[PDB]
Write a protein that binds this ligand. Structure first.
Ligand SMILES: [Zn+2]
Lengths: 74, 317
């Protein structure tokens, strides 16, 4: 599927949806520099939580995920 | 040699007899006694007959209770939850005109924003017993359990700055709505056709990507799978409140415009660095800013709004 950085480079990498959001973020650490820890993916207005499964979100191939960087508030 | 009561839920207890030749951890495991991690201490008569909270080396039965009480958590959850509870015991809430807000300490402003927002959500409850109970306690005036719990669930670390908006939505993923909310999206294409996409309950009161009511309703054009424009628009919406969240974006909050929202969160600082969260509400045609216990008021404010909270929706198109 497609994932876009806010006003930024958008790549698509496809992996069969058995995958846990932890794993999309995990293959994301293997394709772009960022650590799964800091990456929060947003799809169709919902933050994807690590526990649930791409299949769970009705996400079809060629669908658009959004990568937002975790903010640090103190 | 002493006897101690071991539990993970405060309802089921077992006797564990201990000697004083190794540490508590050596003989039993990671244990808390009155909030204190005493795992690496040697058992003494003071703790005789007393109850202890165990975090690992769980029984088969205790594990069953852990899952029931807290849901499926990683093995470190209990240690993290209990320790966070002790770490955060010293945090203070200040109350202004009955509004409770968490006093700034150890980079916790993001939490002040999460809690103050949650305090505003009508008719919500948590699926996880432990979380629900902690929540009820939170509303009772005792917020330690709820705070520590939410950090454990959010995999926050005490003292480290963290994203407010992100935590708010993980927390809500554990909640449910006690009333009826409904939102319906209509998508259409001349070849594929029309599609109604329905959301009910909490799912109908939250959206990440938009921070204004108009933008949620406004018609959105893109390309369909078949190789043409797919359109999308909101065609019904009936909610008790509406939580819209997006990236820190700069705007002017004005009460002259006679806003729709009851409250909003603001991110102060730069984004590639460590900032500060502030919770703000409109009551009084004025924006009351709750800066982690510190209260101030403005007519308008140049700020980067993240989360926005709207009242109940009754919309049809
Ligand atoms: Zn189409």
């Amino acid at each position: 599927i497609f994932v876009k950085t806010l006003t930024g480079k958008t790549i698509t990498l496809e992996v069969e949806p058995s995958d846990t959001i932890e794993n999309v973020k995990a293959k994301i650490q293997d394709k772009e520099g960022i650590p799964p820890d800091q990456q929060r993916l947003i799809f169709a207005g919902k933050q994807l939580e690590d526990g649930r499964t791409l299949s769970d979100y009705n996400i079809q191939k060629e669908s658009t995920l959004h990568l937002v960087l975790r903010l640090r508030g103190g | 040699t002493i006897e101690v009561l071991v539990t993970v839920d405060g309802v089921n207890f077992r006797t564990v007899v201990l000697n004083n030749k190794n540490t508590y951890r050596s003989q039993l495991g990671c244990v808390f006694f009155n909030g204190a991690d005493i795992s690496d201490t040697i058992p003494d008569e003071k703790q005789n007959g007393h109850s202890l909270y165990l975090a690992d080396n769980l029984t088969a039965d205790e594990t069953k209770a852990l899952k029931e009480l807290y849901g499926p958590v990683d093995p470190t959850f209990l240690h993290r939850f209990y320790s966070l509870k002790a770490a955060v015991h010293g945090w203070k809430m200040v109350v202004c005109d009955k509004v409770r807000s968490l006093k700034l300490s150890d980079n916790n402003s993001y939490l002040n924003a999460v809690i103050m927002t949650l305090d505003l959500l009508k008719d919500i409850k948590f699926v996880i017993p432990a979380l629900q109970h902690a929540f009820m306690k939170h509303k009772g005036g005792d917020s330690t359990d709820f705070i520590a719990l939410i950090m454990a669930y959010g995999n926050c670390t005490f003292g480290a700055p963290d994203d407010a908006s992100r935590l708010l939505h993980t927390v809500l993923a554990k909640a449910e709505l006690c009333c009826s909310a409904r939102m319906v999206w209509r998508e259409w294409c001349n070849v594929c056709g029309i599609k109604d996409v329905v959301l009910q309950g909490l799912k109908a009161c939250c959206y990440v990507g938009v921070q204004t009511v108009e933008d949620l309703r406004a018609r959105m054009t893109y390309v369909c799978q078949c190789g043409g424009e797919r359109h999308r628009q909101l065609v019904e919406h009936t909610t008790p409140w509406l939580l819209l969240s997006g990236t820190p974006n700069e705007k002017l909050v004005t009460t002259s415009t006679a806003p729709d929202f009851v409250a909003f969160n603001v991110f102060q600082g730069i984004e590639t660095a460590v900032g500060h969260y502030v919770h703000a509400r409109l009551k009084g045609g004025l924006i009351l800013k709750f800066d982690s216990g510190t209260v101030s008021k403005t007519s308008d404010w140049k700020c980067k709004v993240t989360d926005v909270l709207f009242p109940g929706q009754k919309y049809s198109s």
